[PDB]
Scaffold this active site. Structure first.
Site, mmCIF file in Angstrom:
data_model
loop_
_atom_site.group_PDB
_atom_site.id
_atom_site.type_symbol
_atom_site.label_atom_id
_atom_site.label_comp_id
_atom_site.label_asym_id
_atom_site.label_seq_id
_atom_site.Cartn_x
_atom_site.Cartn_y
_atom_site.Cartn_z
ATOM 1 N N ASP A 134 3.129 2.907 8.307
ATOM 2 C CA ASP A 134 1.958 2.033 8.316
ATOM 3 C C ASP A 134 2.202 0.717 7.587
ATOM 4 O O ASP A 134 2.284 0.681 6.355
ATOM 5 C CB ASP A 134 0.744 2.748 7.715
ATOM 6 C CG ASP A 134 -0.574 2.097 8.110
ATOM 7 O OD1 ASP A 134 -0.615 0.860 8.285
ATOM 8 O OD2 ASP A 134 -1.576 2.827 8.249
ATOM 9 N N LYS B 163 1.736 4.788 -1.036
ATOM 10 C CA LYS B 163 0.946 5.924 -1.488
ATOM 11 C C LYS B 163 1.455 7.171 -0.778
ATOM 12 O O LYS B 163 2.159 7.066 0.234
ATOM 13 C CB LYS B 163 -0.554 5.702 -1.219
ATOM 14 C CG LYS B 163 -0.929 5.565 0.241
ATOM 15 C CD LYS B 163 -2.413 5.271 0.377
ATOM 16 C CE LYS B 163 -2.751 4.758 1.763
ATOM 17 N NZ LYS B 163 -4.169 4.310 1.849
ATOM 18 N N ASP C 38 0.830 -1.203 0.000
ATOM 19 C CA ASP C 38 0.000 0.000 0.000
ATOM 20 C C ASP C 38 0.867 1.257 0.000
ATOM 21 O O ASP C 38 0.676 2.174 0.799
ATOM 22 C CB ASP C 38 -0.962 -0.007 1.189
ATOM 23 C CG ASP C 38 -2.099 0.985 1.028
ATOM 24 O OD1 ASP C 38 -2.499 1.252 -0.127
ATOM 25 O OD2 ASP C 38 -2.593 1.499 2.053
ATOM 26 N N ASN D 152 1.305 7.705 3.024
ATOM 27 C CA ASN D 152 2.200 6.890 3.834
ATOM 28 C C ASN D 152 3.648 7.354 3.759
ATOM 29 O O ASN D 152 4.534 6.670 4.282
ATOM 30 C CB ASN D 152 2.104 5.421 3.416
ATOM 31 C CG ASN D 152 0.837 4.755 3.915
ATOM 32 O OD1 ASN D 152 0.235 5.195 4.894
ATOM 33 N ND2 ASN D 152 0.429 3.684 3.244
ATOM 34 N N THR E 24 -4.528 0.797 -2.992
ATOM 35 C CA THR E 24 -5.318 1.972 -3.322
ATOM 36 C C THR E 24 -5.435 2.094 -4.834
ATOM 37 O O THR E 24 -4.425 1.936 -5.533
ATOM 38 C CB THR E 24 -4.662 3.231 -2.731
ATOM 39 O OG1 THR E 24 -4.381 3.011 -1.343
ATOM 40 C CG2 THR E 24 -5.570 4.444 -2.860
HETATM 41 C C1 LIG Z 1 0.166 7.183 7.478
HETATM 42 C C2 LIG Z 1 -0.811 6.605 8.497
HETATM 43 N N1 LIG Z 1 -2.198 6.558 7.974
HETATM 44 C C3 LIG Z 1 -3.171 6.220 9.029
HETATM 45 C C4 LIG Z 1 -2.702 5.185 10.052
HETATM 46 C C5 LIG Z 1 -2.560 7.798 7.224
HETATM 47 C C6 LIG Z 1 -3.585 7.440 6.126
HETATM 48 C C7 LIG Z 1 -3.138 8.935 8.108
HETATM 49 N N2 LIG Z 1 -2.061 9.725 8.682
HETATM 50 C C8 LIG Z 1 -1.610 9.608 9.986
HETATM 51 O O1 LIG Z 1 -2.045 8.828 10.829
HETATM 52 C C9 LIG Z 1 -0.486 10.519 10.313
HETATM 53 C C10 LIG Z 1 0.609 10.085 11.053
HETATM 54 C C11 LIG Z 1 1.629 10.991 11.314
HETATM 55 C C12 LIG Z 1 2.827 10.655 12.061
HETATM 56 C C13 LIG Z 1 3.791 11.493 12.656
HETATM 57 N N3 LIG Z 1 4.778 10.817 13.246
HETATM 58 N N4 LIG Z 1 4.471 9.513 13.030
HETATM 59 C C14 LIG Z 1 5.179 8.388 13.435
HETATM 60 C C15 LIG Z 1 4.738 7.159 13.141
HETATM 61 C C16 LIG Z 1 3.460 7.094 12.357
HETATM 62 C C17 LIG Z 1 2.902 5.792 11.998
HETATM 63 C C18 LIG Z 1 3.418 4.518 12.153
HETATM 64 C C19 LIG Z 1 2.537 3.503 11.673
HETATM 65 C C20 LIG Z 1 1.370 4.026 11.168
HETATM 66 S S1 LIG Z 1 1.337 5.728 11.272
HETATM 67 N N5 LIG Z 1 2.802 8.151 11.982
HETATM 68 C C21 LIG Z 1 3.291 9.378 12.308
HETATM 69 N N6 LIG Z 1 1.602 12.263 10.860
HETATM 70 C C22 LIG Z 1 0.536 12.688 10.138
HETATM 71 N N7 LIG Z 1 0.556 14.013 9.687
HETATM 72 C C23 LIG Z 1 -0.261 14.593 8.679
HETATM 73 C C24 LIG Z 1 0.890 15.537 8.337
HETATM 74 C C25 LIG Z 1 1.659 14.910 9.515
HETATM 75 C C26 LIG Z 1 1.973 15.836 10.734
HETATM 76 O O2 LIG Z 1 3.101 16.250 11.019
HETATM 77 N N8 LIG Z 1 0.848 16.156 11.481
HETATM 78 C C27 LIG Z 1 0.928 17.003 12.647
HETATM 79 C C28 LIG Z 1 -0.523 11.833 9.841
#
Ligand SMILES: CCN(CC)[C@@H](C)CNC(=O)c1cc(-c2cnn3ccc(-c4cccs4)nc23)nc(N2CC[C@H]2C(=O)NC)c1
Length: 290
Positions: free
Chosen positions: A147, A128, A126, A131, A167
Protein backbone atom coordinates in the site's frame (compact mmCIF):
# COMPACT_ATOMS: atom_id res chain seq x y z
CA UNK A 1 -12.56 -2.54 -20.21
CA UNK A 2 -9.63 -4.88 -19.63
CA UNK A 3 -10.30 -5.86 -16.01
CA UNK A 4 -13.99 -6.75 -16.38
CA UNK A 5 -13.10 -8.76 -19.49
CA UNK A 6 -10.03 -10.65 -18.23
CA UNK A 7 -10.39 -11.09 -14.45
CA UNK A 8 -12.79 -13.03 -12.23
CA UNK A 9 -13.44 -11.37 -8.87
CA UNK A 10 -13.37 -13.34 -5.62
CA UNK A 11 -13.60 -12.54 -1.91
CA UNK A 12 -12.52 -9.36 -0.15
CA UNK A 13 -9.04 -9.23 1.38
CA UNK A 14 -9.10 -5.90 3.23
CA UNK A 15 -11.17 4.70 0.06
CA UNK A 16 -10.53 1.36 -1.61
CA UNK A 17 -11.13 -2.38 -1.46
CA UNK A 18 -8.67 -5.23 -2.03
CA UNK A 19 -10.20 -8.39 -3.47
CA UNK A 20 -8.57 -11.60 -4.63
CA UNK A 21 -9.02 -12.19 -8.34
CA UNK A 22 -7.94 -14.65 -11.03
CA UNK A 23 -6.82 -13.80 -14.54
CA UNK A 24 -9.19 -15.76 -16.78
CA UNK A 25 -6.55 -16.46 -19.49
CA UNK A 26 -3.77 -17.96 -17.38
CA UNK A 27 -5.50 -18.87 -14.12
CA UNK A 28 -2.97 -16.89 -12.07
CA UNK A 29 -4.38 -15.33 -8.91
CA UNK A 30 -3.83 -11.69 -7.96
CA UNK A 31 -4.84 -9.01 -5.48
CA UNK A 32 -6.76 -6.09 -6.99
CA UNK A 33 -6.97 -2.71 -5.28
CA UNK A 34 -10.24 -1.19 -6.53
CA UNK A 35 -10.72 2.59 -6.39
CA UNK A 36 -13.93 4.40 -7.32
CA UNK A 37 -12.97 7.28 -9.64
CA UNK A 38 -16.39 8.91 -10.09
CA UNK A 39 -16.61 12.66 -9.40
CA UNK A 40 -13.01 12.88 -8.18
CA UNK A 41 -11.42 16.28 -7.74
CA UNK A 42 -8.32 17.26 -9.69
CA UNK A 43 -6.47 16.74 -6.41
CA UNK A 44 -7.91 13.22 -6.15
CA UNK A 45 -6.94 12.41 -9.74
CA UNK A 46 -3.35 13.45 -9.03
CA UNK A 47 -3.08 11.41 -5.82
CA UNK A 48 -4.26 8.27 -7.61
CA UNK A 49 -1.94 8.94 -10.56
CA UNK A 50 0.88 9.33 -8.03
CA UNK A 51 -0.01 6.00 -6.42
CA UNK A 52 -0.02 4.08 -9.71
CA UNK A 53 3.26 5.73 -10.71
CA UNK A 54 4.92 4.80 -7.40
CA UNK A 55 3.66 1.21 -7.55
CA UNK A 56 4.98 0.86 -11.10
CA UNK A 57 8.44 2.13 -10.11
CA UNK A 58 9.08 -0.01 -7.02
CA UNK A 59 10.31 -3.50 -7.94
CA UNK A 60 11.99 -5.23 -4.99
CA UNK A 61 11.81 -8.66 -3.31
CA UNK A 62 10.32 -7.09 -0.16
CA UNK A 63 7.67 -4.90 -1.84
CA UNK A 64 4.35 -5.93 -3.35
CA UNK A 65 4.71 -6.26 -7.11
CA UNK A 66 2.39 -4.38 -9.46
CA UNK A 67 1.16 -6.50 -12.37
CA UNK A 68 -1.28 -4.16 -14.14
CA UNK A 69 -2.87 -0.72 -13.76
CA UNK A 70 -6.29 -0.65 -15.44
CA UNK A 71 -8.54 2.42 -15.73
CA UNK A 72 -12.15 1.63 -16.61
CA UNK A 73 -15.13 3.99 -16.50
CA UNK A 74 -15.89 4.80 -12.87
CA UNK A 75 -13.21 2.50 -11.43
CA UNK A 76 -9.44 2.04 -11.40
CA UNK A 77 -7.69 -1.28 -10.74
CA UNK A 78 -4.19 -1.76 -9.34
CA UNK A 79 -3.42 -5.47 -9.79
CA UNK A 80 -0.64 -6.99 -7.67
CA UNK A 81 0.84 -10.44 -7.25
CA UNK A 82 -1.07 -12.36 -4.59
CA UNK A 83 0.88 -13.10 -1.42
CA UNK A 84 -0.69 -15.75 0.80
CA UNK A 85 1.45 -15.87 3.96
CA UNK A 86 -0.81 -13.49 5.87
CA UNK A 87 0.19 -10.59 8.08
CA UNK A 88 3.66 -10.71 9.62
CA UNK A 89 2.46 -10.19 13.20
CA UNK A 90 -0.10 -12.99 12.88
CA UNK A 91 2.60 -15.37 11.63
CA UNK A 92 4.88 -14.58 14.58
CA UNK A 93 2.31 -15.40 17.28
CA UNK A 94 1.86 -18.83 15.64
CA UNK A 95 5.55 -19.74 16.02
CA UNK A 96 6.76 -22.09 18.73
CA UNK A 97 10.30 -20.68 18.49
CA UNK A 98 10.88 -16.93 18.09
CA UNK A 99 14.09 -15.16 19.10
CA UNK A 100 15.99 -11.92 18.57
CA UNK A 101 17.60 -13.56 15.53
CA UNK A 102 14.17 -14.03 13.97
CA UNK A 103 13.17 -10.45 14.77
CA UNK A 104 16.44 -9.23 13.25
CA UNK A 105 15.69 -11.21 10.08
CA UNK A 106 12.22 -9.66 9.84
CA UNK A 107 13.37 -6.08 10.41
CA UNK A 108 16.25 -6.54 7.95
CA UNK A 109 13.74 -7.29 5.19
CA UNK A 110 11.61 -4.31 6.22
CA UNK A 111 14.73 -2.13 6.21
CA UNK A 112 15.58 -3.42 2.72
CA UNK A 113 12.19 -2.31 1.38
CA UNK A 114 12.35 1.09 3.09
CA UNK A 115 15.89 1.60 1.78
CA UNK A 116 14.65 0.76 -1.73
CA UNK A 117 11.83 3.30 -1.40
CA UNK A 118 14.18 6.05 -0.23
CA UNK A 119 16.72 5.39 -3.01
CA UNK A 120 13.86 5.97 -5.48
CA UNK A 121 12.68 9.15 -3.75
CA UNK A 122 9.55 7.67 -2.12
CA UNK A 123 8.56 8.09 1.53
CA UNK A 124 5.91 5.57 2.54
CA UNK A 125 4.68 7.69 5.51
CA UNK A 126 2.42 4.90 6.87
CA UNK A 127 4.56 1.98 8.02
CA UNK A 128 2.48 -0.25 10.30
CA UNK A 129 1.89 -3.98 10.90
CA UNK A 130 -1.22 -4.10 8.70
CA UNK A 131 1.01 -3.09 5.76
CA UNK A 132 3.53 -5.90 6.42
CA UNK A 133 2.42 -9.00 4.51
CA UNK A 134 4.21 -12.31 3.99
CA UNK A 135 4.97 -14.47 1.01
CA UNK A 136 3.88 -18.08 1.42
CA UNK A 137 6.18 -20.42 3.33
CA UNK A 138 6.41 -22.42 0.09
CA UNK A 139 7.75 -19.30 -1.68
CA UNK A 140 10.38 -18.21 0.87
CA UNK A 141 8.24 -16.28 3.40
CA UNK A 142 9.64 -12.89 2.43
CA UNK A 143 8.15 -9.83 4.11
CA UNK A 144 6.23 -7.64 1.65
CA UNK A 145 5.66 -3.92 2.16
CA UNK A 146 2.24 -2.98 0.81
CA UNK A 147 0.00 0.00 0.00
CA UNK A 148 1.53 3.26 -1.26
CA UNK A 149 -1.70 5.27 -1.31
CA UNK A 150 -0.17 7.71 1.19
CA UNK A 151 3.38 7.67 -0.20
CA UNK A 152 4.97 10.89 -1.47
CA UNK A 153 7.72 11.60 -3.98
CA UNK A 154 10.70 13.62 -2.74
CA UNK A 155 13.75 15.12 -4.46
CA UNK A 156 16.89 13.87 -2.74
CA UNK A 157 16.91 15.24 0.80
CA UNK A 158 14.32 17.94 0.08
CA UNK A 159 12.00 18.21 3.08
CA UNK A 160 8.85 20.23 3.66
CA UNK A 161 5.61 20.09 5.61
CA UNK A 162 3.93 17.64 3.24
CA UNK A 163 0.83 17.64 5.46
CA UNK A 164 -0.39 15.13 8.00
CA UNK A 165 -0.28 11.38 7.34
CA UNK A 166 0.24 8.24 9.39
CA UNK A 167 -1.21 6.16 12.21
CA UNK A 168 -1.10 7.49 15.82
CA UNK A 169 1.16 4.89 17.42
CA UNK A 170 3.73 5.23 14.63
CA UNK A 171 3.79 9.00 14.06
CA UNK A 172 7.17 10.70 14.31
CA UNK A 173 7.82 13.73 16.56
CA UNK A 174 8.44 16.03 13.59
CA UNK A 175 5.06 15.24 12.01
CA UNK A 176 3.35 15.81 15.36
CA UNK A 177 5.10 19.19 15.64
CA UNK A 178 4.03 19.97 12.04
CA UNK A 179 7.71 20.48 11.21
CA UNK A 180 9.12 19.78 7.74
CA UNK A 181 9.88 16.09 7.32
CA UNK A 182 10.95 13.47 4.80
CA UNK A 183 12.60 10.04 4.71
CA UNK A 184 13.41 9.76 8.48
CA UNK A 185 9.70 9.40 9.32
CA UNK A 186 9.82 5.86 7.92
CA UNK A 187 12.84 5.10 10.11
CA UNK A 188 11.00 6.22 13.25
CA UNK A 189 8.15 3.87 12.33
CA UNK A 190 10.71 1.10 11.82
CA UNK A 191 11.92 1.75 15.36
CA UNK A 192 8.43 1.39 16.82
CA UNK A 193 7.93 -1.86 14.90
CA UNK A 194 11.32 -3.24 15.97
CA UNK A 195 10.36 -2.46 19.58
CA UNK A 196 7.09 -4.37 19.18
CA UNK A 197 8.88 -7.29 17.50
CA UNK A 198 11.05 -7.75 20.60
CA UNK A 199 8.57 -7.53 23.50
CA UNK A 200 5.14 -7.58 21.87
CA UNK A 201 3.89 -4.19 23.09
CA UNK A 202 4.50 -0.70 21.70
CA UNK A 203 7.09 1.75 23.06
CA UNK A 204 4.65 4.71 23.18
CA UNK A 205 1.12 4.13 24.39
CA UNK A 206 -1.74 5.78 26.28
CA UNK A 207 -5.51 5.37 26.02
CA UNK A 208 -5.53 9.19 25.95
CA UNK A 209 -4.35 9.90 22.40
CA UNK A 210 -3.12 13.37 23.39
CA UNK A 211 -0.96 11.90 26.15
CA UNK A 212 0.29 9.40 23.57
CA UNK A 213 1.40 12.31 21.38
CA UNK A 214 3.08 14.03 24.34
CA UNK A 215 5.15 10.90 25.02
CA UNK A 216 6.12 10.55 21.35
CA UNK A 217 7.32 14.15 21.02
CA UNK A 218 9.42 13.67 24.16
CA UNK A 219 10.81 10.41 22.76
CA UNK A 220 10.30 8.89 26.20
CA UNK A 221 10.39 5.12 25.80
CA UNK A 222 12.29 2.73 28.06
CA UNK A 223 13.35 -0.91 28.40
CA UNK A 224 11.64 -2.03 31.63
CA UNK A 225 12.73 -5.09 33.56
CA UNK A 226 12.30 -8.03 33.56
CA UNK A 227 11.50 -8.71 29.89
CA UNK A 228 14.21 -6.39 28.55
CA UNK A 229 16.90 -7.83 30.83
CA UNK A 230 17.48 -10.70 28.38
CA UNK A 231 17.66 -8.47 25.29
CA UNK A 232 21.13 -7.89 23.87
CA UNK A 233 22.54 -4.35 24.23
CA UNK A 234 23.13 -4.15 20.46
CA UNK A 235 19.39 -4.59 19.85
CA UNK A 236 18.63 -1.80 22.33
CA UNK A 237 21.25 0.33 20.57
CA UNK A 238 19.55 -0.03 17.17
CA UNK A 239 16.22 1.03 18.67
CA UNK A 240 17.93 4.04 20.26
CA UNK A 241 19.33 5.13 16.89
CA UNK A 242 15.91 4.67 15.24
CA UNK A 243 13.82 6.44 17.92
CA UNK A 244 15.93 9.62 18.04
CA UNK A 245 13.70 12.70 18.09
CA UNK A 246 16.26 14.69 16.08
CA UNK A 247 15.47 13.69 12.48
CA UNK A 248 18.98 14.60 11.33
CA UNK A 249 20.70 12.33 13.87
CA UNK A 250 18.24 9.46 13.29
CA UNK A 251 19.80 6.43 11.63
CA UNK A 252 19.00 5.90 7.95
CA UNK A 253 17.87 2.68 6.28
CA UNK A 254 21.21 1.93 4.62
CA UNK A 255 23.07 2.80 7.84
CA UNK A 256 20.76 0.45 9.76
CA UNK A 257 21.50 -2.40 7.33
CA UNK A 258 25.13 -2.16 8.52
CA UNK A 259 24.34 -2.28 12.25
CA UNK A 260 25.96 -5.37 13.85
CA UNK A 261 22.62 -6.67 15.15
CA UNK A 262 21.42 -6.73 11.52
CA UNK A 263 24.40 -7.82 9.41
CA UNK A 264 26.06 -9.99 12.10
CA UNK A 265 22.91 -11.76 13.25
CA UNK A 266 24.29 -15.19 14.14
CA UNK A 267 26.95 -13.78 16.50
CA UNK A 268 25.22 -10.68 17.94
CA UNK A 269 21.51 -11.47 18.21
CA UNK A 270 20.31 -13.75 21.00
CA UNK A 271 18.87 -17.12 19.96
CA UNK A 272 16.79 -17.65 23.12
CA UNK A 273 13.05 -18.15 22.65
CA UNK A 274 10.96 -15.21 23.90
CA UNK A 275 7.64 -16.75 24.92
CA UNK A 276 6.53 -13.58 26.73
CA UNK A 277 6.89 -11.69 23.44
CA UNK A 278 4.59 -14.19 21.69
CA UNK A 279 2.05 -13.87 24.51
CA UNK A 280 2.12 -10.07 24.52
CA UNK A 281 1.91 -9.94 20.72
CA UNK A 282 -1.26 -12.06 20.82
CA UNK A 283 -2.78 -9.37 23.04
CA UNK A 284 -1.40 -6.66 20.72
CA UNK A 285 -2.97 -8.22 17.62
CA UNK A 286 -6.35 -8.67 19.33
CA UNK A 287 -6.74 -5.00 20.29
CA UNK A 288 -5.74 -3.74 16.83
CA UNK A 289 -8.63 -5.63 15.21
CA UNK A 290 -10.89 -4.20 17.95
C1 LIG B 1 -2.42 -3.59 3.42
C2 LIG B 1 -3.57 -3.00 2.62
N1 LIG B 1 -4.54 -2.28 3.48
C3 LIG B 1 -5.76 -1.90 2.75
C4 LIG B 1 -5.55 -1.46 1.30
C5 LIG B 1 -4.82 -3.01 4.75
C6 LIG B 1 -5.14 -1.99 5.86
C7 LIG B 1 -5.98 -4.04 4.65
N2 LIG B 1 -5.48 -5.31 4.14
C8 LIG B 1 -5.64 -5.75 2.84
O1 LIG B 1 -6.19 -5.14 1.94
C9 LIG B 1 -5.02 -7.08 2.58
C10 LIG B 1 -4.29 -7.33 1.43
C11 LIG B 1 -3.74 -8.59 1.26
C12 LIG B 1 -2.95 -8.97 0.10
C13 LIG B 1 -2.57 -10.24 -0.37
N3 LIG B 1 -1.81 -10.20 -1.46
N4 LIG B 1 -1.67 -8.87 -1.72
C14 LIG B 1 -0.97 -8.27 -2.75
C15 LIG B 1 -0.93 -6.94 -2.87
C16 LIG B 1 -1.68 -6.17 -1.83
C17 LIG B 1 -1.69 -4.71 -1.88
C18 LIG B 1 -1.01 -3.83 -2.71
C19 LIG B 1 -1.32 -2.47 -2.44
C20 LIG B 1 -2.23 -2.33 -1.42
S1 LIG B 1 -2.71 -3.84 -0.80
N5 LIG B 1 -2.33 -6.74 -0.86
C21 LIG B 1 -2.35 -8.10 -0.79
N6 LIG B 1 -3.87 -9.57 2.18
C22 LIG B 1 -4.58 -9.33 3.31
N7 LIG B 1 -4.68 -10.37 4.24
C23 LIG B 1 -5.09 -10.28 5.59
C24 LIG B 1 -4.16 -11.45 5.91
C25 LIG B 1 -3.86 -11.53 4.41
C26 LIG B 1 -4.35 -12.81 3.65
O2 LIG B 1 -3.59 -13.69 3.22
N8 LIG B 1 -5.72 -12.87 3.50
C27 LIG B 1 -6.37 -13.98 2.83
C28 LIG B 1 -5.16 -8.08 3.54
Amino acid sequence: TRFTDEYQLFEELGFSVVRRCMKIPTGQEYAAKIINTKKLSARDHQKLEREARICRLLKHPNIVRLHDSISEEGFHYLVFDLVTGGELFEDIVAREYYSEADASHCIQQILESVNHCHLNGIVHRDLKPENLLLASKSKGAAVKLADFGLAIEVQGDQQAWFGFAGTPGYLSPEVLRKDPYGKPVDMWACGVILYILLVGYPPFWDEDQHRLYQQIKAGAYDFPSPEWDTVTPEAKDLINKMLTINPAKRITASEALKHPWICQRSTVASMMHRQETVDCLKKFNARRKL
